[PDB]
């Protein structure tokens, strides 16, 4: 029905979403992740949060190296997690599940995010109205410097070999928490949104409506209290605003570059 | 009736679901697990949780090696289990048992998960309405780095031999807790869901309905209290949110890769 | 009337259900246990519970070796029994005794589990309605690594000799507690289930109904209190949730592998 | 519908918005970022905030170098964050989403800033009236001195090579916090603005209206309290006015120069 382009791609495979990973763009749009196996020059990475250890060098770009560097940087002295990078929060209405990927911002498997069936005629909401409140807090980012020679490859000649398989290397990874409290009801949206806002900022619709809660990151003790009612979600948001070495966060978003002109990559996702 | 594809396959055989295990894809879809017996290069693994011991090397990928590495990593100093990875929770409606595998996310033996008969005309629920509340908390993951040479095999020539038997190696394993409180009743869903939500967030339908509770992982002391009523399940969820070395968790989900292009593997399960 | 296939076979002969035991599949389906007498390569075993002693090596697979290894592993330091592996609990209805083996999950001798006669026309319940509440707590498992050379035999040539007698070696053994409180009554199921649930979560039907209690494992002091009423069974479940070296548990379930392709074995049991 | 030119471009890619970065102007207007890979002379940078370490020299202009220099300058002695650089705050009305980029000041992806769809006929607001209160606090800036020889390149001859690809180097980067509390309602603007101003400076419209909150920078503890109501946003503004080394701020605005005559660059963005 529509197509959307975004530069901040959502983290669908954490095993393969690491700094310096090179992947084909068509595969990323398809939601696959096909790596381009070629040696890379040593890369330089920097951290948004202030600490005595910000600049790091990685000889071999790998997820283990990225995780170890993040751990040591956040364990370094003079580290402050009091300031975050961004905090988005919105209560919107959805009538299809395929359009719920707009909230995430890129191509996602909603059928696995929420234990539902979407294929076929089930893309429409079972109930009458579908509302959802979503929040996304970005604490810090790891960003990688552009290549000194203009090519990320170590031989500087694999670009000619990689024709047809468009190289695209991950340049940035965003760490933070995410949460959605999707609600399906048979009442009117004017009252469903009123009840949702009252519950979040403080009766029968919220008790007769279908709930679908999905949380990424954050304190587990606060996250598990969501089942206790609508105060649990607001406590999961209010608490844990400041990130600590104990609770760094889970990679939620990542940015990509074209590996040829080193420009930014815009993923494309279609919504029906 | 329908087919679904998912990248996070559910752990059906814990004995064979270990990091680096190579298995045929057709067998995994069939729910069998046929290993590809061939030497593998030493692998590098990383842990989602922050600790002084994150990066590990495994010469021979095996379940005992994975378990020992997980134990030593979680016993290492500067370990924090306060932050989890994900927390999904939903109360949905099911009218068949074969479609209950949507909640798990992959092909499962519901006939062995719940002590029922599904084969034949028994796939439909015995009672009128079937509801179920399910929760899944993912605490941490072990993820393995992509091969440096692009091939996971140690001879780099077994790929030619393994034609027809599509190699697929386990790249990630998810640790966490899972729980379902499936309920069958003769009343209306509008009241059954209301009663379930009231019991979880706080009378005759819940006492005259058929119960089916299935829990994976978590504290045993909290899990055994589920039989005491509906407060036991909510206490099993609320308590044990933060994972500790005493209670690491049971592997619930795992991701797979194609071992030829090192892309992600999407398992396929049909629902009738 | 129906046939069922399951991968988690129930422990019918504890003397012969040990890790590494090789038995014919036809015999296991028949409920016999015919060993395949052939030397085996040394095997590696791992334990689900966290302890300083997880990985063990067994030169000669035997029940005494398995028991000694389990004892020493659970007596090792840094052992935590606070987390279990699974906890299933369901209150179902049965109208035949042959179909009561669905609750166990494999072929069992119900005629010896409950001191009744099933052969002939006695397979039906004597009373009008038959209900049963069953619980199964799995604390930990011992699992054995796949053979390095792909063959479990020590000569690597006994596979050719073992044709017709399909080799099947036990790969995993599950330790835990089990319990069933089978009830036969002349009233309606809608009231029998109500009374059972009220008694378990807290009058004449439960006192005029026929009782059949079967418990495997758990604390003996709590198990013997079942005869005192319906609070004894709920106390046997609530207490002893956390397993200790004093009360490890009895092998209740075991998994098997085909010893040729090392795939998982699915036992088949028919229900009439 | 209209075109606007501004000299303070908004930070859309923090990974590529660093001091000394050279990018094509057409790409910046397109919202792409294509770097001009050429060696640069060592640059001199200065900091708006008063500290013992103000003047810095950067041999290789990179994001990691800029971040490290900012960290060390703000950690230097005799640093005062009591005085900021600017504080803009306005409550305006918007009837389209494409015109909401006027508040930011340059070309932005409103479709990713707010989880909405804009492409096609959805550019209009779903509700009747659209109001928004926005605040932007600029604490300090890093500014780079003009080249001594009049050319930023290190060979002083790459200007002839870079014809057609108009070089444009980032000269200044603004650090600060930003926030918008966009509101959609069905009432009249005369009452919606009244309610918004009363809530910010202190009932049914604000509870039945659709909320869209977007915050960049600032204290996370204060930012997460926005969900609690309208006092959270006013507390996020009132608190954290003075910037500290613990909470420096996120780059929100940057200025650019033409790299040929060293004049200021005016980006152009169209609004429909
Ligand atoms: Ca290079
Ligand atoms: Ca290899
Ligand atoms: Ca052998
Ligand atoms: Ca120059």
Residue numbers in the entry:
A (entry chain O), B (entry chain P), C (entry chain Q), D (entry chain N): 94 to 295, 309 to 378
Text of the article:
A recently found family of pore-forming toxins, called CDC-like proteins (CDCLs), are wide-spread in gut microbes and are a prevalent means of antibacterial antagonism. Analysis of the CDCLs belonging to the phylum Bacteroidota revealed the presence of sets of two-component CDCLs, one long CDCL (CDCLL) with four domains and one short CDCL (CDCLS) lacking the fourth C-terminal domain, that act as a bicomponent complex via a mechanism only previously observed in the mammalian complement MAC. Unlike CDCs, the CDCLs require proteolytic activation with both components containing a proteolytically cleavable activation loop critical to the regulation of pore formation. Here, we present the crystal structure of a proteolytically activated CDCLL and cryo–electron microscopy (cryo-EM) structures of a prepore-like intermediate and the transmembrane pore.
(A) The cryo-EM map at 3.13-Å resolution of the prepore-like structure from focused refinement with C30 symmetry, revealing a circular oligomer with a pore inner diameter of 164 Å and a height of 59 Å. We built an atomic model of the full prepore-like oligomer into the cryo-EM map, which consists of 30 EaCDCLS subunits, each lacking the activation loop and preceding N-terminal region. A comparison of the EaCDCLS protomer in the prepore state with the crystal structure of the monomeric proform of EaCDCLS reveals that while the α-HBs remain in their helical state, the β5 strand of the core D3 β sheet has undergone a complete β-to-α transition to create the HTH motif as observed in the membrane-inserted form of CDCs. This HTH forms a small α barrel within the interior of the circular oligomer. Thus, loss of the activation loop and corresponding β0 strand, together with the transition of β5, has allowed for the β4 and β1 strands of the core β sheet to form oligomeric contacts between adjacent subunits. This corresponds with the canonical oligomeric rearrangement and interactions observed in CDCs. Comparison of the core β sheet between monomeric EaCDCLS and the prepore-like structure also reveals the loss of the twist observed in the monomeric state, with a slight rotation and straightening of the β1-β4 strands. Therefore, we hypothesize that the stacked rings are “prepore-like” structures composed of act-EaCDCLS protein alone, similar to the circular prepore intermediate observed in CDCs. However, any putative physiological prepores would be expected to be composed of 1 EaCDCLL molecule and 29 EaCDCLS molecules, similar to the transmembrane pore, but such a short-lived intermediate would not been captured here because of the long incubation time of the experiment.
